[PDB]
């Protein structure tokens, strides 16, 4: 899809695809050069694949947490921006983006869930996991329910799970133990079991993904959701009154996401790494530029200084930014793939009833170190 003439993006479908499609209409016209931004499905799994044949596009967004994998493949190009370019981000997202003392993408702004809620339905959010199923049950008079979220992505559980003890990869004094996984403790356990309770007694349905949660909360008949801030331009839509807060704690211990830096990588097979450079140092991490992002899909706590400062205002910035402090920032080893395969099986397999939670987490723990043999390619073309 790639040619030396122009720029091709890639970036999630929940994101603000369509205000960088505008940067690109403002590079275009400078320069051109036309950008053109795609979103395709499941485009973090898909971007190793393509590359190694030689095709992918000229940058991919996503997440910080898979560009390690990326980056020990040779998938992606070293980024040089220079010292007056690195002042203007924040340190920690640079420390996002850097793998093996090398930068890696560019940071563009810092995600984390909060827990978002219907103010007329909900004046005072439960601050506890364990008063939700009552929650529930009280609402089911008016009608509705208290809580849907994504069932489908670990992304949106592992924040409960994590909780009372549940982790990725054991951090000692400054690397990552691959062997060393937390999915399997008791704490872990005491989370995805509580989820499953809430699924088997009809709190929740095992079938709920990103758009039947969305639409219920939009419409009003579920009186809270767990998103991040890409999900907001959506509600303001909707015009439920909702407010953005604190996720509720479980067993007295708060709730805490996976903190993810939205970056953006150069492909190392792209014939266009200056343009690539050019478009996202002076047209996209500027404050015009991350503005036409942000108005379409709200970027959360973005990366350039100038412009966070304009937003940190935002009741609901504060509030990610609590929920972020109270996670943790994702690794981004190449084995954070695997873990993510992994708890992606165990949740859907014990929320579904295939399995139980104390199995279904037991064969996550193993495959978080086991499943590297799959991803470990080694370059299907060419050596290391
Ligand atoms: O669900 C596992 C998944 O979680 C994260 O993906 C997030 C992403 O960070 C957000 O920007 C947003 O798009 O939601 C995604 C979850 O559907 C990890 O970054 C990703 O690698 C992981 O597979
Ligand atoms: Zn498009
Ligand atoms: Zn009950
Ligand atoms: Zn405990
Ligand atoms: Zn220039």
Do not use: C
């Given at each position: 899809?790639?040619?030396?003439?122009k720029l091709v993006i890639?970036?999630?479908?929940?994101?603000?695809?369509?205000?960088?499609?505008?940067?690109?209409?403002?590079?275009?016209?400078?320069?051109?050069?036309?950008?053109?931004?795609?979103?395709?499905?499941?485009?973090?799994?898909?971007?190793?694949?393509?590359?190694?044949?030689?095709?992918?596009?000229?940058?991919?967004?996503?997440?910080?947490?898979?560009?390690?994998?990326?980056?020990?493949?040779?998938?992606?190009?070293?980024?040089?921006?220079?010292?007056?370019?690195?002042?203007?981000?924040?340190?920690?997202?640079?420390?996002?983006?850097?793998?093996?003392?090398?930068?890696?993408?560019?940071?563009?702004?810092?995600?984390?869930?909060?827990?978002?809620?219907?103010?007329?339905?909900?004046?005072?959010?439960?601050?506890?996991?364990?008063?939700?199923?009552?929650?529930?049950?009280?609402?089911?008079?008016?009608?509705?329910?208290?809580?849907?979220?994504?069932?489908?992505?670990?992304?949106?559980?592992?924040?409960?799970?994590?909780?009372?003890?549940?982790?990725?990869?054991?951090?000692?004094?400054?690397?990552?133990?691959?062997?060393?996984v937390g999915v399997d403790?008791?704490?872990?356990?005491?989370?995805?079991?509580?989820?499953?309770?809430?699924?088997?007694?009809?709190?929740?349905?095992?079938?709920?993904?990103?758009?039947?949660?969305?639409?219920?909360?939009?419409?009003?008949?579920?009186?809270?959701?767990?998103?991040?801030?890409?999900?907001?331009?959506?509600?303001?839509?909707?015009?439920?009154?909702?407010?953005?807060?604190?996720?509720?704690?479980?067993?007295?211990?708060?709730?805490?996401?996976?903190?993810?830096?939205?970056?953006?990588?150069?492909?190392?097979?792209?014939?266009?790494?200056?343009?690539?450079?050019?478009?996202?140092?002076?047209?996209?991490?500027?404050?015009?530029?991350?503005?036409?992002?942000?108005?379409?899909?709200?970027?959360?706590?973005?990366?350039?200084?100038?412009?966070?400062?304009?937003?940190?205002?935002?009741?609901?910035?504060?509030?990610?930014?609590?929920?972020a402090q109270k996670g943790?920032?994702?690794?981004?080893?190449?084995?954070?793939?695997?873990?993510?395969?992994?708890?992606?099986?165990?949740?859907?397999?014990?929320?579904?009833?295939?399995?139980?939670?104390?199995?279904?987490?037991?064969?996550?723990?193993?495959?978080?170190?086991?499943?590297?043999?799959?991803?470990?390619?080694?370059?299907?073309?060419?050596?290391?």
């Open positions: 899809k790639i040619e030396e003439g890639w970036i999630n479908g929940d994101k603000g695809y369509n205000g960088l499609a505008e940067v690109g209409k403002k590079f275009e016209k400078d320069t051109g050069i036309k950008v053109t931004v795609e979103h395709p499905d499941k485009l973090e799994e898909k971007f190793p694949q393509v590359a190694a044949t030689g095709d992918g596009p000229d940058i991919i967004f996503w997440a910080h947490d898979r560009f390690g994998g990326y980056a020990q493949s040779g998938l992606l190009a070293e980024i040089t921006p220079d010292k007056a370019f690195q002042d203007k981000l924040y340190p920690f997202t640079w420390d996002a983006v850097r793998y093996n003392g090398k930068l890696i993408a560019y940071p563009i702004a810092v995600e984390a869930l909060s827990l978002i809620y219907n103010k007329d339905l909900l004046p005072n959010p439960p601050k506890t996991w364990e008063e939700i199923p009552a929650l529930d049950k009280e609402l089911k008079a008016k009608g509705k329910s208290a809580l849907m979220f994504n069932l489908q992505e670990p992304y949106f559980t592992w924040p409960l799970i994590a909780a009372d003890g549940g982790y990725a990869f054991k951090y000692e004094n400054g690397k990552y133990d691959i062997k060393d403790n008791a704490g872990a356990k005491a989370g995805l079991t509580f989820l499953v309770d809430l699924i088997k007694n009809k709190h929740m349905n095992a079938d709920t993904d990103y758009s039947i949660a969305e639409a219920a909360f939009n419409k009003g008949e579920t009186a809270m959701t767990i998103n991040g801030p890409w999900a907001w331009s959506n509600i303001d839509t909707s015009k439920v009154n909702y407010g953005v807060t604190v996720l509720p704690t479980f067993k007295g211990q708060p709730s805490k996401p996976f903190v993810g830096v939205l970056s953006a990588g150069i492909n190392a097979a792209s014939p266009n790494k200056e343009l690539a450079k050019e478009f996202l140092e002076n047209y996209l991490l500027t404050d015009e530029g991350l503005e036409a992002v942000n108005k379409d899909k709200p970027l959360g706590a973005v990366a350039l200084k100038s412009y966070e400062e304009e937003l940190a205002k935002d009741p609901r910035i504060a509030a990610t930014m609590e929920n943790e920032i994702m690794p981004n080893i190449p084995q954070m793939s695997a873990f993510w395969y992994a708890v992606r099986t165990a949740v859907i397999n014990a929320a579904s009833g295939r399995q139980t939670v104390d199995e279904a987490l037991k064969d996550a723990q193993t495959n978080a170190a086991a499943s590297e043999e799959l991803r470990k390619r080694r370059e299907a073309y060419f050596e290391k």
